[PDB]
Amino acid sequence: KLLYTSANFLGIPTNRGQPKIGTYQGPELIRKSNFFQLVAEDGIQLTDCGDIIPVELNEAEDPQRFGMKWSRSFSLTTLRIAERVEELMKQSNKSTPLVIVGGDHSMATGTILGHAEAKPDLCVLWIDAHGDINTPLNSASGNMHGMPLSFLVKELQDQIPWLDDFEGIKPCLNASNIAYIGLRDLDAHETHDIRKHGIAYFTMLDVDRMGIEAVIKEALLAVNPRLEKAIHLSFDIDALDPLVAPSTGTAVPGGLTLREGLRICEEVSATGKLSVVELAELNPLLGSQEDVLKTQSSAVHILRACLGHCRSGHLPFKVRNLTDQGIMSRAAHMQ
Amino acid sequence: KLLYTSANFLGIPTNRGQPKIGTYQGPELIRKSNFFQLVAEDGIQLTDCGDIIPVELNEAEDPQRFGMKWSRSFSLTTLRIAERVEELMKQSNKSTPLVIVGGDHSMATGTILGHAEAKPDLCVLWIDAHGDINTPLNSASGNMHGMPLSFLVKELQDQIPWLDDFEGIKPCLNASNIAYIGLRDLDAHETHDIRKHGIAYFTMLDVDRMGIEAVIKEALLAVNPRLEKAIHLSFDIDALDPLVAPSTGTAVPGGLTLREGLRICEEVSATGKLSVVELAELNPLLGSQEDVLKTQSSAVHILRACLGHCRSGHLPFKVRNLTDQGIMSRAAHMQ
Amino acid sequence: KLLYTSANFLGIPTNRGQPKIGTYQGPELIRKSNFFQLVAEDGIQLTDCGDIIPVELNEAEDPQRFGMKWSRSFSLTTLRIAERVEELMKQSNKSTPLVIVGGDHSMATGTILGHAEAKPDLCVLWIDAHGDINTPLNSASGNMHGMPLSFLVKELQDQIPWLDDFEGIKPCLNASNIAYIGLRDLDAHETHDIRKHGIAYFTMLDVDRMGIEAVIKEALLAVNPRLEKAIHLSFDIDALDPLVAPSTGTAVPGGLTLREGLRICEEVSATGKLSVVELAELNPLLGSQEDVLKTQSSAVHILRACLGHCRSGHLPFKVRNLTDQGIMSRAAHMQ
Numbered sequence A, B, C: 001k002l003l004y005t006s007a008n009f010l011g012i013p014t015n016r017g018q019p020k021i022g023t024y025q026g027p028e029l030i031r032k033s034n035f036f037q038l039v040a041e042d043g044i045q046l047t048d049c050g051d052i053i054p055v056e057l058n059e060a061e062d063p064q065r066f067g068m069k070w071s072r073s074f075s076l077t078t079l080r081i082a083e084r085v086e087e088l089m090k091q092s093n094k095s096t097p098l099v100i101v102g103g104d105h106s107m108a109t110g111t112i113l114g115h116a117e118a119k120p121d122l123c124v125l126w127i128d129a130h131g132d133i134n135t136p137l138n139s140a141s142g143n144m145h146g147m148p149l150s151f152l153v154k155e156l157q158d159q160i161p162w163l164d165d166f167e168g169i170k171p172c173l174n175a176s177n178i179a180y181i182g183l184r185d186l187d188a189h190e191t192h193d194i195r196k197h198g199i200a201y202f203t204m205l206d207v208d209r210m211g212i213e214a215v216i217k218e219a220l221l222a223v224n225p226r227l228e229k230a231i232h233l234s235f236d237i238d239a240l241d242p243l244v245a246p247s248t249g250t251a252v253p254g255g256l257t258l259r260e261g262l263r264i265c266e267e268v269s270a271t272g273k274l275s276v277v278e279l280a281e282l283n284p285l286l287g288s289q290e291d292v293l294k295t296q297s298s299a300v301h302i303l304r305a306c307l308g309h310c311r312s313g314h315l316p317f318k319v320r321n322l323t324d325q326g327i328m329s330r331a332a333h334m335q
């Protein structure tokens, strides 16, 4: 009665992908929640596999290159992440999903790279207000958390500058393997690339016109039509409306409701093909104490849904009976 | 042009059903609002029938029994509530609905018991994030507000321990007479009992997939197919999302929007069969001053909807005319 | 690839239409936002045409007349607004929309009057929790922001008292030219007049039952069936739920989501017939600092949508290419 009876948990406290200090505290925000207890209460065995230590160079060792900020910290961190994810997913090769808590979204280049090494035919569902697919010369910000997909997409490689230290970051995704849900703040060059290469995408306008149910169905149809592929679910907390996830660095109004976020995760979970879910951009240093609690709570409900938690209830593992205790019931007494 | 031209109002400041002090202030939160004025402005005559005084024993007089906390305060309070509700509903036997403001949800055992004494064929619509149908030996918390339905459901009586002081609490509901809307935090044994006995239930997942309109229709179909039965609407404020009802003791994210809550109440009201509506779990001692105002406001809009308030407008009782005042209009002047 | 390549912007800091000081700061709230920058980034040339100076008489010069508060300030301000709007719209006679930021909603009598002078066959889409169509002797409050449409509707002129200084305020709208979306707090006499004269109206109950998509379609069908008419979009920020627009003087729970507000504006924009959009009732002196930021943000997203901003993305004006810079790509290197 469980699609997944065990799961692994990994923290990746990336913070060199964007300028606001605090994404490094994301994994701890989830560890100090009741997430682990609640997951155990649904009968799932969850193993805490610890944290990846990002590589964080100093400014002298890691100057701007092609406008990118902290690009060598990024390339080194990417390779370290990929090795660890690869090993975890191969020890796993009912499947055992890997739950990853970030950390800013730059971690995804590493997680997908390593995941693809174990499962090369995977698809990616990217849940985000943003495209995170800027190529370096088009990025206004130079922030690596806005570029992680570009390094992975084969079709985009003529717009990525060559760098010796990026050699091991091999493009492992075709444009046809990615689908977005939740977009509402694409940069113009992302829009161009997404349309040019036919990346499936469902923006908040699509959610409004189609409804989340049809959006989920169509996204799964686009990249995983017969549920043959492993799914890498990359969930940026900023996909959710700032009313329910305020503690994040690039909040955009008009986002997914928590319920819409839950539906995406419930449907993905129920495919039986959830292989990795990562949750990016939690920043417990942003907003009020209550803002952080709201954001933490949203994240926990989301990750629980990914692992198969049902809002319609779960049956007990053992049904309790009054008589076994030598207790007299009302029905018994009345007779 | 009014389905209900008069109504009764009753406070029940129960607070021994759960541990957080403050539910006893629920009725006053509504009395100090503009609810009464607004109800009068729609042409309804609302009579304040005062408060029920709960029985609150001391710890020595009311030790834990079968893990239940304050069970004798509960049984005594239940009987006191039922007598008062019964008398009010029989003086009432256009019908006159009774509006009850709590108070924690443990009051429902008493309100339904008394209501059923006046109208034995009634149905119950239970609007709640929670099932409130735990039987005592299955309750992790021992909190009576999580058990009120179990004592009333005939099918569950072999799982209720006999207690002499509970004898007058007679099961007056069949499983087939109850429908839930809004559920998102069932305990495993509740899930078991609800499914085993075929209690109609529409969780937030059902609301997401079906839409509130279909959920309301199907809930009414399940328990009141031809609108032959009186309706007992038991509305836990925690059914609403914490964004609109934060001041309540067991808040769960991902709840009904205020609009969805309004639709449930509007449709129930429009049946002409609303006999009792109770609103449970307001706690003005929880949250900020603004949190309390939001929660108060949500409650007022909800109760107004129950009594027949229309968001699409009400016609004036007397249409005013400019000439009656001896005033010259623009149209008159221009001629 | 742009329906509108230029636009005009006008502030109207009306504050004598209602009692709470602060609506006069509405235009500045938008000017100090990033609205202008974001509009330019989508390729639209936006010209700041400055502010209209409302006429604000003293109490001695402007006593109550027919219960109206500040009615002579209103009539004088109305004529001043209308002259300026008329001149702007005639210099404009791809069309050039006029974006107006208020200011309390009393400004609409002036904006529509002047707009109609340039485009007499226009239709009005009124997005508001309120009807703003009270005739003076029926207004409980005497606040002019609750009456602006009544002076304009030909069918209502036998209920408007004649005043010499209102002579230049000529009724320029038929009941058949107005459609409301968002209503949830009509006064009884407004309900009477709206139904009696067949004004198309879609309240929040209609939005709940029909969905915003059908509501927008039906509103446009009612007043602009073949998109032959110029559209005057009058958007009261209080149409939006107080959760996203708290800083406004008459907030009502259960409003449009930001997304629903965006859909209305996106569809209106896409007709190619958006001629004037005004945004009323911003009050930066109400609520917390965060409340004001939320309200500002909602307003900016709304006005951007009116001017044609697409949540699904915009293409770059020039597509950037790696080689033009003499940079070596990964694809190039690998070959």
Ligand SMILES: CC(C)[C@H](N)C(=O)O
Pocket: A130, A131, A132, A134, A139, A140, A141, A142, A143, A145, A146, A147, A186, A187, A250
């Ligand atoms: C990621 C987001 C904030 C933006 N597209 C960027 O690249 O910086």
Ligand SMILES: CC(C)[C@H](N)C(=O)O
Pocket: B130, B131, B132, B134, B139, B140, B141, B142, B143, B145, B146, B147, B186, B187, B250
């Ligand atoms: C009521 C709720 C909080 C829970 N099911 C309980 O029984 O305590």
Ligand SMILES: CC(C)[C@H](N)C(=O)O
Pocket: C130, C131, C132, C134, C139, C140, C141, C142, C143, C145, C146, C147, C186, C187, C250
């Ligand atoms: C505008 C609103 C607050 C109300 N209908 C009034 O006329 O004052």
Ligand SMILES: [Mn+2]
Pocket: A128, A129, A130, A236, A238, A239, A250
């Ligand atoms: Mn993002």
Ligand SMILES: [Mn+2]
Pocket: A105, A128, A130, A132, A145, A236, A280, A281
């Ligand atoms: Mn992201």
Ligand SMILES: [Mn+2]
Pocket: B128, B129, B130, B236, B238, B239, B250
């Ligand atoms: Mn509850």
Ligand SMILES: [Mn+2]
Pocket: B105, B128, B130, B132, B145, B236, B280, B281
């Ligand atoms: Mn309850």
Ligand SMILES: [Mn+2]
Pocket: C128, C129, C130, C236, C238, C239, C250
């Ligand atoms: Mn309004």
Ligand SMILES: [Mn+2]
Pocket: C105, C128, C130, C132, C145, C236, C280, C281
């Ligand atoms: Mn208005």
